[PDB]
């Protein structure tokens, strides 16, 4: 066929009930997730080819960059219910890996802060329960997919992108066949 399992995609053993109908995977310190934001607009593109009624779900990971990635997941979860992760994300992956000026939770605030977010509003969205349970099913959802790597990408908890498996030669070519993939197994 012409998307074929182990090719542009892999499918789950042990397929995930309830999960998200798409799902993404990501960590500040992922130097390929740099690029899926920045450079390849991954998410974007992708949901401009999703049916829809579908909702996408993005999420942070805990195994990169210890005690910072900790903080930087719950800082994703601040970002989620506060609902402005189009305004830190750029900022957050810049001072991770491109100026290096995030060395710590305060530093992660000052992005918040200069993007806008009050510090009244940051600090008690960071230390509500509303966010705790948001850290919880970042982690339960990786926890549950087996996730030792990012980027990610996982549709219906049972089908997860295999972008290895796709050309590189020409970088618009490659996402619109990672979307186009996601689209099909949408449809699945």
């Not at 009930?17 to 500040?28: C, D, K, R």
């Amino acid at each position: 066929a012409q998307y074929e399992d182990g090719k542009q995609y892999t499918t789950l053993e042990k397929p995930v009930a309830g999960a998200p109908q798409v799902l993404e995977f990501f960590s500040f310190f992922c130097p390929h997730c740099y690029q899926f934001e920045e450079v390849l607009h991954i998410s974007d593109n992708v949901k401009k080819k999703l049916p829809e009624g579908v909702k996408m779900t993005k999420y942070h990971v805990n195994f990169m960059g210890g005690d910072l990635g900790k903080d930087l997941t719950q800082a994703w979860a601040v970002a989620m219910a506060l609902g402005v992760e189009d305004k830190v994300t750029v900022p957050l992956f810049e001072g991770v890996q491109k100026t290096q000026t995030i060395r710590s939770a305060s530093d992660i605030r000052d992005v918040f802060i200069n993007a806008g977010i009050k510090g009244e509003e940051y600090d008690a969205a960071w230390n509500s329960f509303v966010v705790k349970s948001l850290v919880a099913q970042q982690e339960k959802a990786a926890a549950d997919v087996q996730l030792r790597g990012v980027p990610a990408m996982f549709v219906n908890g049972k089908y997860q992108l295999n972008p290895q498996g796709m050309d590189t030669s020409n970088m618009d070519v490659f996402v619109q066949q990672y979307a186009d993939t996601v689209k099909y197994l949408s449809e699945k």
